[PDB]
Amino acid sequence: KVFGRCELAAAMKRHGLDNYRGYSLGNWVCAAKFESNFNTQATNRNTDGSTDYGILQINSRWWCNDGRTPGSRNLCNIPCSALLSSDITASVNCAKKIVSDGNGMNAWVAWRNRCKGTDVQAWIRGCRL
Ligand SMILES: [Cl-]
Ligand SMILES: [Cl-]
Ligand SMILES: [Cl-]
Ligand SMILES: [Cl-]
Ligand SMILES: [Cl-]
Ligand code: NA
Incomplete structure (x- = not known):
C-alpha cells in the first residue's frame, strides 16, 4: 500500500509514534518519505x-x-x-525498539542526512490529526 502523507501521519499517531522518544510526528513522516x-x-x-x-x-x-x-x-x-x-x-x-537503541533516529541514515535539523513540521502541515 502506498500511503498518503496525512494518512500515514494519522496512522503513525494512532500507533503512538508522535513524540515517541521526543521525535515529533514530522520526523517520522520525513523518514518514511525518504x-x-x-x-x-x-x-x-x-x-x-x-x-x-x-x-x-x-x-x-x-x-x-x-x-x-x-x-x-x-x-x-x-x-x-x-x-x-x-x-x-x-x-x-x-x-520503537530501534529508536530506543542509543542513537535515536540516527539509526536511519536517511533521517540523519535528509530530515535531521530541517523543517520537519512541513510533513504534517494541513493534516487533520
Ligand atoms: Cl508527499
Ligand atoms: Cl512535527
Ligand atoms: Cl521468522
Ligand atoms: Cl538469516
Ligand atoms: Cl541518505
Ligand atoms: Na535477521
Missing part, C-alpha cells in the same frame, strides 16, 4: 547482504528474520515479511 516513498512494500538489498523492509526500511541484520542474512539477529522477533503489510503495526512496534 526511506520508502510511503510504500509499505518497499525492499532494498544492502551491500553486506542484509535487506531493508517496509515504510521505515528496517534492516534484517539486527531487527527481523528473513532466513538469508548470515550472522544476523532478529531483535524485533518477527519475520521481515510482516514489515510489508498494509497494516503498519509491526513496523511501528519495531521502530
Whole structure:
C-alpha cells in the first residue's frame, strides 16, 4: 500500500509514534518519505547482504528474520515479511525498539542526512490529526 502523507501521519499517531522518544510526528513522516516513498512494500538489498523492509526500511541484520542474512539477529522477533503489510503495526512496534537503541533516529541514515535539523513540521502541515 502506498500511503498518503496525512494518512500515514494519522496512522503513525494512532500507533503512538508522535513524540515517541521526543521525535515529533514530522520526523517520522520525513523518514518514511525518504526511506520508502510511503510504500509499505518497499525492499532494498544492502551491500553486506542484509535487506531493508517496509515504510521505515528496517534492516534484517539486527531487527527481523528473513532466513538469508548470515550472522544476523532478529531483535524485533518477527519475520521481515510482516514489515510489508498494509497494516503498519509491526513496523511501528519495531521502530520503537530501534529508536530506543542509543542513537535515536540516527539509526536511519536517511533521517540523519535528509530530515535531521530541517523543517520537519512541513510533513504534517494541513493534516487533520
Ligand atoms: Cl508527499
Ligand atoms: Cl512535527
Ligand atoms: Cl538469516
Ligand atoms: Cl521468522
Ligand atoms: Cl541518505
Ligand atoms: Na535477521
